[PDB]
Design an enzyme around this catalytic site. Structure first.
Site, mmCIF file in Angstrom:
data_model
loop_
_atom_site.group_PDB
_atom_site.id
_atom_site.type_symbol
_atom_site.label_atom_id
_atom_site.label_comp_id
_atom_site.label_asym_id
_atom_site.label_seq_id
_atom_site.Cartn_x
_atom_site.Cartn_y
_atom_site.Cartn_z
ATOM 1 N N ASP A 99 -15.363 -5.231 9.284
ATOM 2 C CA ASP A 99 -16.435 -4.450 8.490
ATOM 3 C C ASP A 99 -17.339 -5.559 7.754
ATOM 4 O O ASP A 99 -18.545 -5.265 7.528
ATOM 5 C CB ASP A 99 -16.022 -3.362 7.569
ATOM 6 C CG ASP A 99 -17.240 -2.499 7.155
ATOM 7 O OD1 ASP A 99 -18.007 -1.903 7.925
ATOM 8 O OD2 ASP A 99 -17.575 -2.655 5.833
ATOM 9 N N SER A 143 -12.021 10.197 -3.931
ATOM 10 C CA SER A 143 -11.715 9.994 -2.837
ATOM 11 C C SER A 143 -10.020 9.885 -2.771
ATOM 12 O O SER A 143 -9.556 9.740 -3.714
ATOM 13 C CB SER A 143 -12.309 8.700 -2.034
ATOM 14 O OG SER A 143 -11.981 7.469 -2.731
ATOM 15 N N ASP A 150 -6.469 7.781 -0.552
ATOM 16 C CA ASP A 150 -6.003 6.905 0.293
ATOM 17 C C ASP A 150 -4.987 7.649 1.309
ATOM 18 O O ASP A 150 -4.199 8.332 0.576
ATOM 19 C CB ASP A 150 -5.606 5.681 -0.491
ATOM 20 C CG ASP A 150 -6.587 5.116 -0.769
ATOM 21 O OD1 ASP A 150 -7.883 5.113 -0.573
ATOM 22 O OD2 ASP A 150 -6.346 4.081 -1.650
ATOM 23 N N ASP A 166 -12.669 7.919 -8.059
ATOM 24 C CA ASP A 166 -13.966 8.640 -7.733
ATOM 25 C C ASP A 166 -13.837 9.827 -6.709
ATOM 26 O O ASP A 166 -14.838 10.381 -6.546
ATOM 27 C CB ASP A 166 -14.804 7.466 -6.902
ATOM 28 C CG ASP A 166 -14.230 7.153 -5.369
ATOM 29 O OD1 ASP A 166 -12.968 7.633 -4.972
ATOM 30 O OD2 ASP A 166 -14.679 6.364 -4.577
ATOM 31 N N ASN A 180 -9.165 4.837 3.227
ATOM 32 C CA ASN A 180 -9.928 5.745 1.885
ATOM 33 C C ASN A 180 -10.807 6.739 2.748
ATOM 34 O O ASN A 180 -11.726 6.417 3.653
ATOM 35 C CB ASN A 180 -10.724 4.783 0.888
ATOM 36 C CG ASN A 180 -11.205 5.364 -0.069
ATOM 37 O OD1 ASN A 180 -11.371 6.517 -0.195
ATOM 38 N ND2 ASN A 180 -11.621 4.446 -1.059
ATOM 39 N N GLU A 208 1.052 -1.159 0.045
ATOM 40 C CA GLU A 208 -0.031 -0.084 -0.005
ATOM 41 C C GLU A 208 0.784 1.180 -0.094
ATOM 42 O O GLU A 208 0.566 2.173 -0.691
ATOM 43 C CB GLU A 208 -0.907 -0.114 1.407
ATOM 44 C CG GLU A 208 -2.159 -1.151 1.227
ATOM 45 C CD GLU A 208 -2.886 -0.821 0.199
ATOM 46 O OE1 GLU A 208 -2.970 0.025 -0.656
ATOM 47 O OE2 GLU A 208 -3.755 -1.581 -0.094
ATOM 48 N N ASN A 213 -8.019 8.623 -5.727
ATOM 49 C CA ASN A 213 -8.794 7.392 -6.359
ATOM 50 C C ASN A 213 -9.686 8.185 -7.570
ATOM 51 O O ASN A 213 -9.781 9.336 -7.523
ATOM 52 C CB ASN A 213 -9.690 6.691 -5.419
ATOM 53 C CG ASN A 213 -9.058 6.077 -4.360
ATOM 54 O OD1 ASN A 213 -7.816 5.640 -4.481
ATOM 55 N ND2 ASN A 213 -9.300 6.319 -3.060
#
Ligand SMILES: [Cl-]
Ligand SMILES: [Cl-]
Ligand SMILES: [Cl-]
Ligand SMILES: [Cl-]
Ligand SMILES: [Cl-]
Ligand code: NA
Length: 129
Positions: free
Chosen positions: A101, A50, A52, A48, A59, A35, A46
């Site tokens: 989650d 967003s 990270d 979209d 995110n 990562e 990202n």
């Protein structure tokens, strides 16, 4: 801060990630390697919109607030900048929520694509833990 491999393994273990939700320490070190290359200051946008943040590339769509991700949540209740600190506490505590989650470490696409099913113990081999 750019951690060393064993240095990060030790910090993650001290912060309770080793075997957290059943994921051995090498899984977490492997995820951080791919990562962020162990760099707490890593950021990546990202598609979209967003972003990270940090060693585990958490995110802003769901987990932290950066003020520029429309419609997002802040489920870790932290500014995304907290995920860039030399102190990994905020990244660890948020990662614990993420991995709980429902999909486990599959939440990290890079873990699924590069760590899952591999000899992840290699990531902690030789480390004083
Ligand atoms: Cl390495
Ligand atoms: Cl391991
Ligand atoms: Cl936002
Ligand atoms: Cl905030
Ligand atoms: Cl799981
Ligand atoms: Na957010």
């Amino acid at each position: 801060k750019v951690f060393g491999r064993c240095e990060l393994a030790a910090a993650m273990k001290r912060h309770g990630l080793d075997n957290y939700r059943g994921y051995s320490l090498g899984n977490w070190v492997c995820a951080a390697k791919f990562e962020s290359n162990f760099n707490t200051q890593a950021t990546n946008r990202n598609t979209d919109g967003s972003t990270d943040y940090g060693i585990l590339q958490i995110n802003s769509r769901w987990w932290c607030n950066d003020g520029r991700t429309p419609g997002s949540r802040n489920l870790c209740n932290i500014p995304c900048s907290a995920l860039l600190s030399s102190d990994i506490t905020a990244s660890v505590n948020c990662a614990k929520k993420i991995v709980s989650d429902g999909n486990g470490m599959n939440a990290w696409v890079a873990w699924r694509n590069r760590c899952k099913g591999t000899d992840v113990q290699a990531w902690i081999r030789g480390c004083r833990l």
